[PDB]
mmCIF file of C-alpha atoms and ligand atoms in Angstrom:
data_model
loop_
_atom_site.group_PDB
_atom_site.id
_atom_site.type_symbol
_atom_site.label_atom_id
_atom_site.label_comp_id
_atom_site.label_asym_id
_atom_site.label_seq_id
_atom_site.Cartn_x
_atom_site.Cartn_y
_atom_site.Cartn_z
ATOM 1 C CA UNK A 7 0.000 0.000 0.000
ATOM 2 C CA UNK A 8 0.843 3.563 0.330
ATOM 3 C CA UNK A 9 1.322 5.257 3.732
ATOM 4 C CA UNK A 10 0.533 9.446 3.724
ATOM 5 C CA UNK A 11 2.571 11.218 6.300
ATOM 6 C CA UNK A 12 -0.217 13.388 7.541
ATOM 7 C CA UNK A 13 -0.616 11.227 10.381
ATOM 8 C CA UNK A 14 2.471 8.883 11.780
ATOM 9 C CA UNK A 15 3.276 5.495 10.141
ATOM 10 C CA UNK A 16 1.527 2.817 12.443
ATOM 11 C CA UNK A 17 1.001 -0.048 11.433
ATOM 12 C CA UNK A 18 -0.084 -3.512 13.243
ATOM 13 C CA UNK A 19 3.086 -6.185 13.596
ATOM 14 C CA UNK A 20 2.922 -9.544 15.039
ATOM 15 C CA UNK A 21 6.435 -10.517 17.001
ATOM 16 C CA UNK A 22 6.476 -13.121 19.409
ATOM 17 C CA UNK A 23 3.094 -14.606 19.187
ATOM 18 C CA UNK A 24 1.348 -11.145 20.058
ATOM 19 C CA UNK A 25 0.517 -8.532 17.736
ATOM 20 C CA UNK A 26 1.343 -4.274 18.223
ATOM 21 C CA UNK A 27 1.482 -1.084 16.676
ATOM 22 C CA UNK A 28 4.644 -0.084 15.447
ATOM 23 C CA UNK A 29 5.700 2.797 13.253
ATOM 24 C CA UNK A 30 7.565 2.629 9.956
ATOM 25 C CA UNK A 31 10.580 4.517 10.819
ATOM 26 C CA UNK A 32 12.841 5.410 8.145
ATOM 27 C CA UNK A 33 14.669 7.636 10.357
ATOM 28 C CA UNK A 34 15.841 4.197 12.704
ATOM 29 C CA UNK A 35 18.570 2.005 11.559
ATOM 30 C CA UNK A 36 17.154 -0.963 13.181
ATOM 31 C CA UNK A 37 13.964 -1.963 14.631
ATOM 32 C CA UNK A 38 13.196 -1.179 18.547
ATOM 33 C CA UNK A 39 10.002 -2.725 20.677
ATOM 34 C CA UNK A 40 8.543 -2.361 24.004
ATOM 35 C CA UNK A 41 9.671 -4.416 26.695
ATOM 36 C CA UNK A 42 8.481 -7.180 26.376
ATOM 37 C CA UNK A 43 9.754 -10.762 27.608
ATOM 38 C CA UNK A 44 11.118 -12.608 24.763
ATOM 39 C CA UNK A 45 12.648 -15.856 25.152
ATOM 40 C CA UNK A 46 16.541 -16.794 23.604
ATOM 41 C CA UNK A 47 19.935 -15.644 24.552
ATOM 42 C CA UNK A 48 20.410 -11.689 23.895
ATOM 43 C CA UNK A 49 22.820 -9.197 24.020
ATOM 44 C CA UNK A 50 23.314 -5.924 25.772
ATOM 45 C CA UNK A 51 23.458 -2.846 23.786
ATOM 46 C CA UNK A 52 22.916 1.116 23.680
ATOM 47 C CA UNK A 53 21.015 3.155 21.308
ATOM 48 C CA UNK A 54 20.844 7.109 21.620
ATOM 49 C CA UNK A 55 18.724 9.481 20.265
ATOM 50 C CA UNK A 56 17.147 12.876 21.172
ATOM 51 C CA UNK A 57 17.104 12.990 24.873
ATOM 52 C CA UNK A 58 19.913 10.595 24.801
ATOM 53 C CA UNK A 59 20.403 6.620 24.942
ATOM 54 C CA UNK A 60 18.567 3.724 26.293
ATOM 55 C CA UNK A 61 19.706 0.693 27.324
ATOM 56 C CA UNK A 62 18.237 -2.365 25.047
ATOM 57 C CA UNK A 63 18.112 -6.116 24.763
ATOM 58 C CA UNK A 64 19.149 -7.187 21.062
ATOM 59 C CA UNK A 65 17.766 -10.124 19.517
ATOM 60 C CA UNK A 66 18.971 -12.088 16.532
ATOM 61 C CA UNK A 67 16.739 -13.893 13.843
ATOM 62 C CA UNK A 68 13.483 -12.988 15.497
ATOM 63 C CA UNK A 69 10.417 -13.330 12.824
ATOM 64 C CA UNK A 70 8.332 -10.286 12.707
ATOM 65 C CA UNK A 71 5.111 -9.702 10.402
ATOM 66 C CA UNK A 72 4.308 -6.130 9.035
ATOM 67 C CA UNK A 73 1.066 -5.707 7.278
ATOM 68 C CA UNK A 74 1.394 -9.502 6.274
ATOM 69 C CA UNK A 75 4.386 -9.308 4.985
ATOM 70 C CA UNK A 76 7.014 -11.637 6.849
ATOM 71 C CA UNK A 77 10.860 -10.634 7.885
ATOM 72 C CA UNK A 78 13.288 -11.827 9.866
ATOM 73 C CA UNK A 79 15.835 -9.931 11.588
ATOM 74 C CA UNK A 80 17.442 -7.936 14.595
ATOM 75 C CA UNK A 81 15.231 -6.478 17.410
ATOM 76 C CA UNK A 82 16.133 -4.373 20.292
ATOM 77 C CA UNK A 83 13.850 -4.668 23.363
ATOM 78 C CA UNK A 84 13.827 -1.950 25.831
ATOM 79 C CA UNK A 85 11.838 1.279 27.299
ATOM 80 C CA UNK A 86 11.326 2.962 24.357
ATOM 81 C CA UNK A 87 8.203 4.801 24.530
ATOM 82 C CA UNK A 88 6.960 3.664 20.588
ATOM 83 C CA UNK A 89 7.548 0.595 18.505
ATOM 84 C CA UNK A 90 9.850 1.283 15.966
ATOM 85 C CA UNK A 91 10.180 -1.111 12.746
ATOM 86 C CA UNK A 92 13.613 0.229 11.427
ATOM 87 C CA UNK A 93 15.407 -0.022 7.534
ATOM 88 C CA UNK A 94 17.197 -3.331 9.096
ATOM 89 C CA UNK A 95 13.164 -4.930 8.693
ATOM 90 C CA UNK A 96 11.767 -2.025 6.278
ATOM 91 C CA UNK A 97 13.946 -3.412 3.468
ATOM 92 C CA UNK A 98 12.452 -6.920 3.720
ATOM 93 C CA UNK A 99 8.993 -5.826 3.215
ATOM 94 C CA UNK A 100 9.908 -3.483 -0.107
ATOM 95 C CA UNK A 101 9.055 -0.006 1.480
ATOM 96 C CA UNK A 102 10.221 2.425 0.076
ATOM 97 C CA UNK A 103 10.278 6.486 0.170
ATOM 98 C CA UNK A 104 8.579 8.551 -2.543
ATOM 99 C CA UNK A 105 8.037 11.741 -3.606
ATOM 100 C CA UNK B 1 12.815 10.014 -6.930
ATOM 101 C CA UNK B 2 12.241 6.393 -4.905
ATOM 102 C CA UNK B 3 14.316 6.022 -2.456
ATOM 103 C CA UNK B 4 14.974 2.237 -1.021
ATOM 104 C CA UNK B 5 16.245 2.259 2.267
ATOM 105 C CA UNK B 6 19.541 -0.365 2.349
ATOM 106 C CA UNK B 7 21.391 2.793 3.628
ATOM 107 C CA UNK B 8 20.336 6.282 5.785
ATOM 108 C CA UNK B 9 18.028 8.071 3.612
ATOM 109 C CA UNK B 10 20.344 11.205 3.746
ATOM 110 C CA UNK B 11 19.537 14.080 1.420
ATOM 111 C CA UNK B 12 20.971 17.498 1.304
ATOM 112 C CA UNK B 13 18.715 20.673 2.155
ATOM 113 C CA UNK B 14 18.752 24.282 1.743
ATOM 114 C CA UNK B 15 17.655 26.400 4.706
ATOM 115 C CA UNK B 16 18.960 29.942 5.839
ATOM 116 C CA UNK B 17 21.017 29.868 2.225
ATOM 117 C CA UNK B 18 22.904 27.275 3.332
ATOM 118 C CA UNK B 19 23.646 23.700 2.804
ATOM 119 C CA UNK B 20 23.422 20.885 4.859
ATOM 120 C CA UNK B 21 22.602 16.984 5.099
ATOM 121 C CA UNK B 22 19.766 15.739 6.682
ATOM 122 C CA UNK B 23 17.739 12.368 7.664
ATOM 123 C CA UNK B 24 13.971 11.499 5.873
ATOM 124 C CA UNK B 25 12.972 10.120 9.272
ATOM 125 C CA UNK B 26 8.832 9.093 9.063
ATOM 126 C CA UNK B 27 9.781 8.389 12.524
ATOM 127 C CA UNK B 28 9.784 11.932 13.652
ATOM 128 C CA UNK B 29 6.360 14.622 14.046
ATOM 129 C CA UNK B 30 8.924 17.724 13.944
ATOM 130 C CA UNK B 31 12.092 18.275 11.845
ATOM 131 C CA UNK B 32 14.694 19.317 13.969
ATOM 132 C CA UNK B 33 18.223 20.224 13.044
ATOM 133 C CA UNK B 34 22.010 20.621 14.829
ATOM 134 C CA UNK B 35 22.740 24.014 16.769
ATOM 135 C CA UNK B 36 23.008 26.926 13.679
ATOM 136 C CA UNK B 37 22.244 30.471 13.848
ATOM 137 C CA UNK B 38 19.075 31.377 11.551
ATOM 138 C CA UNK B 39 17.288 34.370 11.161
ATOM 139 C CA UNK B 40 14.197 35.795 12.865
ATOM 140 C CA UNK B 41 12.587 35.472 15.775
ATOM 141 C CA UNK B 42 12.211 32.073 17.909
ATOM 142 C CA UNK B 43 10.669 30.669 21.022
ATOM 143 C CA UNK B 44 12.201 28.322 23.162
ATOM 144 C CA UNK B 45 10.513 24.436 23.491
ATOM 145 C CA UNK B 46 10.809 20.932 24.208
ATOM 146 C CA UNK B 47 10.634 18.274 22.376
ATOM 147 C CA UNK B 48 11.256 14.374 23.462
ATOM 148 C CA UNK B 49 12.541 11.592 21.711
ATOM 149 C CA UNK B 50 13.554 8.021 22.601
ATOM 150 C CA UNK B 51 16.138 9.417 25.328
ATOM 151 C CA UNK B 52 14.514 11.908 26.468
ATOM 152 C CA UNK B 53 13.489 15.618 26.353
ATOM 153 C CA UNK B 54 16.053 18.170 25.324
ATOM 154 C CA UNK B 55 15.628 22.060 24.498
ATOM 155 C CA UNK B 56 15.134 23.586 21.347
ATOM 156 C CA UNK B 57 14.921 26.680 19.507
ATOM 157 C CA UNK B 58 11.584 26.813 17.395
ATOM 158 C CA UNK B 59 11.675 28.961 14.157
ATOM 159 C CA UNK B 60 8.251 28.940 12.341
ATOM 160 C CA UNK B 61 7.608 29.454 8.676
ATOM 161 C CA UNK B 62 11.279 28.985 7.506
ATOM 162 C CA UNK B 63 11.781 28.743 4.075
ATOM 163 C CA UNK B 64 13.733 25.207 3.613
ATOM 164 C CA UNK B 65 14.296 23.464 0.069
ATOM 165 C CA UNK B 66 14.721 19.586 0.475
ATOM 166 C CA UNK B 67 16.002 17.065 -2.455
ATOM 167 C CA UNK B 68 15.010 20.256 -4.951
ATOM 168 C CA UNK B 69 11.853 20.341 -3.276
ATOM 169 C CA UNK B 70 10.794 23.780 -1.471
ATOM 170 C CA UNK B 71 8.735 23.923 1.842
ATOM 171 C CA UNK B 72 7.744 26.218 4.763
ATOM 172 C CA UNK B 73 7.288 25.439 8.312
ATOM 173 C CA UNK B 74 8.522 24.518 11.686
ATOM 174 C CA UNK B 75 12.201 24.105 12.129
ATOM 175 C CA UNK B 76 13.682 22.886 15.723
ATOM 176 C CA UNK B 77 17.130 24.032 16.161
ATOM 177 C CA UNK B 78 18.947 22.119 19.095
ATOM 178 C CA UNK B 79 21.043 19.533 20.845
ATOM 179 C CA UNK B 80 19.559 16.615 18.262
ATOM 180 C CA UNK B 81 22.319 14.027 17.455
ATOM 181 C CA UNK B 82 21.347 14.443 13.797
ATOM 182 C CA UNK B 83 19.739 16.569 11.518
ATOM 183 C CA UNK B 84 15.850 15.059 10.626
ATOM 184 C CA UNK B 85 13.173 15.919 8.565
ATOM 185 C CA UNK B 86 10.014 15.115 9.891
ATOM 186 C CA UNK B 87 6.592 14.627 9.203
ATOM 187 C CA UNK B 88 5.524 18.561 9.144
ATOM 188 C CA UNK B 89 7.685 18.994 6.137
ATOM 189 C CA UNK B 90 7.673 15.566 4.525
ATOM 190 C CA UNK B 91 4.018 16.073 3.648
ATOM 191 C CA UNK B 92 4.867 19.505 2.292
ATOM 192 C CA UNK B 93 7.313 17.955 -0.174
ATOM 193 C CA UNK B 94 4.899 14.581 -1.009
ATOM 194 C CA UNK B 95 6.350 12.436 0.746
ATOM 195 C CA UNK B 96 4.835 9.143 1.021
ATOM 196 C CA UNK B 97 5.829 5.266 2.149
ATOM 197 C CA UNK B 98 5.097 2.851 -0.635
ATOM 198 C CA UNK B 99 5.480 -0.902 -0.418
HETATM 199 C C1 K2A C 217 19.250 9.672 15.218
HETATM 200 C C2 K2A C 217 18.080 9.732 14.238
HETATM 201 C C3 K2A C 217 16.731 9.542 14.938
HETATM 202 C C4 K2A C 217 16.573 10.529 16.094
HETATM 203 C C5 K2A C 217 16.651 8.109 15.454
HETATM 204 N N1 K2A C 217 15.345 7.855 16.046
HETATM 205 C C6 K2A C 217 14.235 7.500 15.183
HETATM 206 C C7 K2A C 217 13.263 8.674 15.075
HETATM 207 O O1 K2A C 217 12.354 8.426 14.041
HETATM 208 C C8 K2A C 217 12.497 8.882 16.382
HETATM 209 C C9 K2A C 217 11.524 7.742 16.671
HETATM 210 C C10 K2A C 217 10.700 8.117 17.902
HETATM 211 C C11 K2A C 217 9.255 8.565 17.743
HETATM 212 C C12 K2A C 217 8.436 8.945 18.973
HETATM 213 C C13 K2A C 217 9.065 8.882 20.360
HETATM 214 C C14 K2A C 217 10.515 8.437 20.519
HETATM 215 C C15 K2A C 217 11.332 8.057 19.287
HETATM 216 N N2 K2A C 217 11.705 10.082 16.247
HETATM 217 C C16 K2A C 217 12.044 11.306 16.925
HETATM 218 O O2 K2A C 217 12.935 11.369 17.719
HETATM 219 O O3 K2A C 217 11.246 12.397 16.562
HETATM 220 C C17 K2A C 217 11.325 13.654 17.360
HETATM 221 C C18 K2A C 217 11.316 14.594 16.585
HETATM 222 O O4 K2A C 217 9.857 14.673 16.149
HETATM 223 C C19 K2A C 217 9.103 14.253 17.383
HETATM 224 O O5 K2A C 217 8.062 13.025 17.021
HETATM 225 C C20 K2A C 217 8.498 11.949 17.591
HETATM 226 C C21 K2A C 217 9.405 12.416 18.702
HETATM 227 C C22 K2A C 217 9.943 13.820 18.200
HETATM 228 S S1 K2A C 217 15.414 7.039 17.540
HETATM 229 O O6 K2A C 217 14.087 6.696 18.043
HETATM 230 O O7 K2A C 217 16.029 7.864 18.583
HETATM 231 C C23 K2A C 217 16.371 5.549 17.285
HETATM 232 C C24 K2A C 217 15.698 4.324 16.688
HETATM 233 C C25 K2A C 217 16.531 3.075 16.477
HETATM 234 C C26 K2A C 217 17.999 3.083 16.883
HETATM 235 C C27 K2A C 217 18.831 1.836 16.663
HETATM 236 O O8 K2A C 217 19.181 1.842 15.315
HETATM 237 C C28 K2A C 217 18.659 4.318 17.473
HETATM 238 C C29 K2A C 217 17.833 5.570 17.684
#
């Protein structure tokens, strides 16, 4: 489909066996979610933005579905306050900017 | 153009007669760029993002050219860690997620 910007990118995702709202963020390099208790090994990183950094969980090879359309990929788990579905997944599903 | 998103969707802008690089970042409401001196009048704001809140300088109705395409609006001028474009001016320019 094709996504106006007047309002921001959500979108539903399914991760984990549960399903969210995420935004399309072509701004993110990879993809960060809620906390949320995921099981498999993990390891520690730090991601900054405006305000400054968070401390996140990163996952490897974790299946996410965007709008029905499957990828597989890196996701960081930690307090951010929005789902974010970075270019890492964005790529896999063909989206693309246009104007 | 279409823009695929394997790397940063970095594009240079225009603003105060000056050039600079910026991120297409869906991800953000506001566009807000590093400290620079601009013209006019401001107030000062806050804005939050995944670290945090910082303070910002808001400028309102600047005159900013992005990718050859011309817009007017809100510009946050402030302690970000990189310059964005947000959703306020990527709908001026037509900016719209396709996949
Ligand atoms: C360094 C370039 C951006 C700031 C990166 N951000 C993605 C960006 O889209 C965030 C994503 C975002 C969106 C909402 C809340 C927190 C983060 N939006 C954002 O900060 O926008 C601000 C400016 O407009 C306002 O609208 C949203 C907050 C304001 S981010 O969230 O901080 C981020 C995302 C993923 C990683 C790991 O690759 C690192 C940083």
């Amino acid at each position: 489909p094709q996504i106006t910007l007047w309002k921001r990118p959500l979108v539903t995702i399914k991760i984990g066996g549960q399903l969210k709202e995420a935004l399309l963020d072509t701004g993110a390099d990879d993809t960060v979610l809620e906390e949320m208790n995921l099981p498999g090994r993990w390891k520690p990183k730090m991601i900054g933005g405006i305000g400054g950094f968070i401390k996140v969980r990163q996952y490897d090879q974790i299946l996410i579905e965007i709008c029905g359309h499957k990828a597989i990929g890196t996701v960081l788990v930690g307090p951010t306050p929005v789902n974010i579905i970075g270019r890492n997944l964005l790529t896999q599903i063909g989206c693309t900017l246009n104007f």
